[PDB]
Amino acid sequence: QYSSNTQQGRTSIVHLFEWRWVDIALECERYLAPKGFGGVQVSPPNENVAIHNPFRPWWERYQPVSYKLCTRSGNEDEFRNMVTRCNNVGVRIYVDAVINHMCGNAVSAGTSSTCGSYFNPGSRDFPAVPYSGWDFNDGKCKTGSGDIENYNDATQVRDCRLSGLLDLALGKDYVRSKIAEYMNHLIDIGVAGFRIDASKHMWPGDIKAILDKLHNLNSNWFPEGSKPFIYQEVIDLGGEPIKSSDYFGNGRVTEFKYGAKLGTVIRKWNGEKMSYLKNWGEGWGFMPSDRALVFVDNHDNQRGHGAGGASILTFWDARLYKMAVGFMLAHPYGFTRVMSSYRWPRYFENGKDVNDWVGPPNDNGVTKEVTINPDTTCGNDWVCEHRWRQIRNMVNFRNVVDGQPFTNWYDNGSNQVAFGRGNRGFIVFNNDDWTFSLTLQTGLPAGTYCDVISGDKINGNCTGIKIYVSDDGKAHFSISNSAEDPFIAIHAESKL
Amino acid sequence: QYSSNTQQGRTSIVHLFEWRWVDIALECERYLAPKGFGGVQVSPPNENVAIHNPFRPWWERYQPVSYKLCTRSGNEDEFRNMVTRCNNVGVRIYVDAVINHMCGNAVSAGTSSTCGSYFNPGSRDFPAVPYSGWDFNDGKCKTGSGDIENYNDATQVRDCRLSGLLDLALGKDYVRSKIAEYMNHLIDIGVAGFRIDASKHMWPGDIKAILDKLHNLNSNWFPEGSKPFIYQEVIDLGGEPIKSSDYFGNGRVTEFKYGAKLGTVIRKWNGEKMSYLKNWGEGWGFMPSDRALVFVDNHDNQRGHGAGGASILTFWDARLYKMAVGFMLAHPYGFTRVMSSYRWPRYFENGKDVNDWVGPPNDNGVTKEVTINPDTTCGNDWVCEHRWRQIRNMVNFRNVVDGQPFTNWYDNGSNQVAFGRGNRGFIVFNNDDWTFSLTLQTGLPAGTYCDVISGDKINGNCTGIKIYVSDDGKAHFSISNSAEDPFIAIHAESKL
Ligand SMILES: [Ca+2]
Ligand SMILES: [Ca+2]
Ligand SMILES: [Cl-]
Ligand SMILES: [Cl-]
Secondary structure, three states: OOOOOOOOOOOEEEEEOOOOHHHHHHHHHHHHOOOOOOEEEEOOOOOEEOOOOOOOOOOHHHOEOOOOOOEOOEOHHHHHHHHHHHHOOOOEEEEEEOOOEEEEOOOOOEOOEOOOOOEEOOOOEEOOOOEOHHHEOOOOOOOOOOEOOOOOOHHHHHHOEEOOEEEEOOOOHHHHHHHHHHHHHHHHHOOOEEEEOOHHHOOHHHHHHHHHOOOOOOOOOOOOOOOOEEEEOOOOOOOOOOOHHHHOOOOEEEOHHHHHHHHHHHOOOOOOOHHHHOOOOHHHOOOOHHHEEEOOOOOOHHHOOOOOHHHOOOHHHHHHHHHHHHHHHHOOOOEEEEEEOEOOOOOEEOOEEOOOOOOOOEOOOOEOOOOEOOOOOEOOOEOOHHHOHHHHHHHHHHHHOOOOOEEEEEOOOOOOOEEEEOOOEEEEEOOOOOOEEEEEEOOOOOEEEEOOOOOOEEOOEEOOOEEEEOOOOEEEEEEOOOOOOOEEEEEHHHEO | OOOOOOOOOOOEEEEEOOOOHHHHHHHHHHHHOOOOOOEEEEOOOOOEEOOOOOOOOOOHHHOEOOOOOOEOOEOHHHHHHHHHHHHOOOOEEEEEEOOOEEEEOOOOOEOOEOOOOOEEOOOOEEOOOOEOHHHEOOOOOOOOOOEOOOOOOHHHHHHOEEOOEEEEOOOOHHHHHHHHHHHHHHHHHOOOEEEEOOHHHOOHHHHHHHHHOOOOOOOOOOOOOOOOEEEEOOOOOOOOOOOHHHHOOOOEEEOHHHHHHHHHHHOOOOOOOHHHHOOOOHHHOOOOHHHEEEOOOOOOHHHOOOOOHHHOOOHHHHHHHHHHHHHHHHOOOOEEEEEEOEOOOOOEEOOEEOOOOOOOOEOOOOEOOOOEOOOOOEOOOEOOHHHOHHHHHHHHHHHHOOOOOEEEEEOOOOOOOEEEEOOOEEEEEOOOOOOEEEEEEOOOOOEEEEOOOOOOEEOOEEOOOEEEEOOOOEEEEEEOOOOOOOEEEEEHHHEO
16 A cells, blocks of 8 residues: 555656546646656545535535546546546556545535435435445544544544534444445556545544455556555644554555645745755654655645645745745655646635635536646646646656665755755755855766756757756856746756 | 742733833732732843844843843833832732843844843853853754754754754753842742743753752742742644653643634634533643643734744734633633733734734833723733733633632534533633524522623623523523624622
């Protein structure tokens, strides 16, 4: 469950948040694959509730109605097509498994669901699964409201409803089998792994129990004995009885400390600065590197009230986003995931985004297709950070320097750093307010390297900055505190 | 060190942030004392640096220059006068001890100091103490910058400089004696205890070592064997090697989880709601009640980037501030402290308050006196939350119900709660968006009680809401979701 199952060098997976299958299919073939991306974190592919108030939320997909692969992204047919096509290009698909609950109990009974299955939350009836009264933890939960009231009572966290969300009774085999059936169905199609949603609200043991019921990856794209890659969403920044570690037995864990801290350091808040990043990794109190799944921002927290808080850097602050993402990708710690969002009428009001609920760009609740522009950017309001050059090349930079150790770190006791990955890469940062000039030991073979940030190496030449390295490995760098991008990166493949 | 040393029933101490001695003297006599306040947390009474950039900060008082009781609040003469006068009315004085460091090392040498003592930070010379090179942890600190670089290395946290702040060598006896001398000087004047600043950056043992060198409270106002009340500033919300508990041996600890969480619950963020507050206290993972020192907001975090984050409620959001403060005071857990701030040109910019550095209201760096208006409010820009009726009476409510157990808790599985303190008090809350009507068991003797929130009991009558309780203890309540104050509180002394 620890192996990504990616294909050939590929070190990172992108989350094409709320995208439609037909669009990820294409995206895979036309970009993802040729641009070295490992895989795609898809949105909950199961039939969910249709929330009309507010209008079609970004979170209605985390409120299950059945396990029919039939969401706003498409139907099973379209879904299979995507996996098949993406797999044919070495781009893995990772399904967002929503398995601790169904929809909110308050929700009105009816057919208001992405696939039209009937369902009555008040009576606990989900005929399309099927689930019923005794398949939910109603009895088991010890709280007065039946809701999670105190995150200090590890037990009520897993046995009670998260925000009123009907908590499936995962202790029962009927339920574990129904879920395993769902996840196995996916696997048979060609899935490479999952993102176990709300892992904190599930007993590690239950998650294991369920995982153990899984088949092996489809012999048609994976080797014999391939195990579904498993990363579980657990938000643990201390202060709670439940610890990320509690889940290492099932697979990787989402390290939310990573993105939080990094952002705090890039934003230069709380006296933090980049020179303090010498021992970035387990050194800053982060879960063991090969049990971690990192990212700067994830779909949820990029909206402000996630784990990190206002400190989380998102696409909105591009100049600093690109940097934090660049640093992350360049550093060896954890397994990386890059975000790819969509734009929305962000309107802050005393502390909150009154619109952080807004769903994907659409036309009367119908998700807009992702259109590509001659300059490789997207249309219809899809941000497409994964297509940005500064990130894209760094997504590749990671690939190129894979396996190489962290070294040749330099700092100016401020915000001007730089470090390399063995002899295949080097990256230099300047988050200070004064031009950065100095000759650094790049630990790279002599030659002329193209900065894959300001440009690329095309037809034997750089389109951006050129860096000159000499036998002794040294090279001079110059990054103005107001440069387009205050950081430069070079690697074995960007050498002329 | 655990006993507050307060006087007769008095359960809470107010922090008259940045106030001048002459003003606290008066305040004590004219208000504090008659209104049942226990004590006052004064600002660092020692000579500090004079920061002209930005102009006279709220934090220059946490950057020591000598131990001369001579700050912007006044001179020793004025200081003694305050203590003497306040003590004469049963109002204790608690000094903010700034003892882990002096000023920042970067600071220019000179006499730019509240009392004019000379001092050279670069050479480590504080002739007015006196301290010198070997009296600071310069050697001891293992980091490269000499600054605290990783809060995951408990040891460098106490041996290295906090934000460049020269870290006093508290391992040495010369230093412990110099500090003890300072704290003992204070005690001889009439101090009741302290607030040990930056306790996290000091070894529990050092703090004990220093405390042990202290005399006993002045026999002129305290009983024989009175021990200085000790509450240490330690910000611990988990995730770190250093734990609040690590200091229980010295005295109480600032529980920052309290204010954070409560605010999150009142703001109705992260699915939180008041009905979940059944077992508020150690039940929510908080440090042992009689080792805790609670508050909603403290001088630091009320500015946003403190422990709690944007979740911390301050005077700015009065409607919700009053409630959180009311709940806190009404609930038995921990020893309470109420904040009293001053207004400032708050200007937010992408995440931060570009003015959270602004000092107290003034006239060319001279602190403005605190003026009182006919309606009991303050002038010259001093907020004076401690004078607000909703708080003031609750500060007394605590006194009245002292010793009584938590009971008769009620919730509507939402935000409409209520609970009582034995048979001397009852409080009802409505933080829901719909009028609150219901007959609750107040566990109070039958009679007609005045709501000490909407009004008072004066000359045998209520000036605000009247609550009618019958023998059976029941009483009806009605709080509109848009009432002036969405919570009502009654107690033994507000009965006609
Ligand atoms: Ca659960
Ligand atoms: Ca220290
Ligand atoms: Cl996630
Ligand atoms: Cl404090």
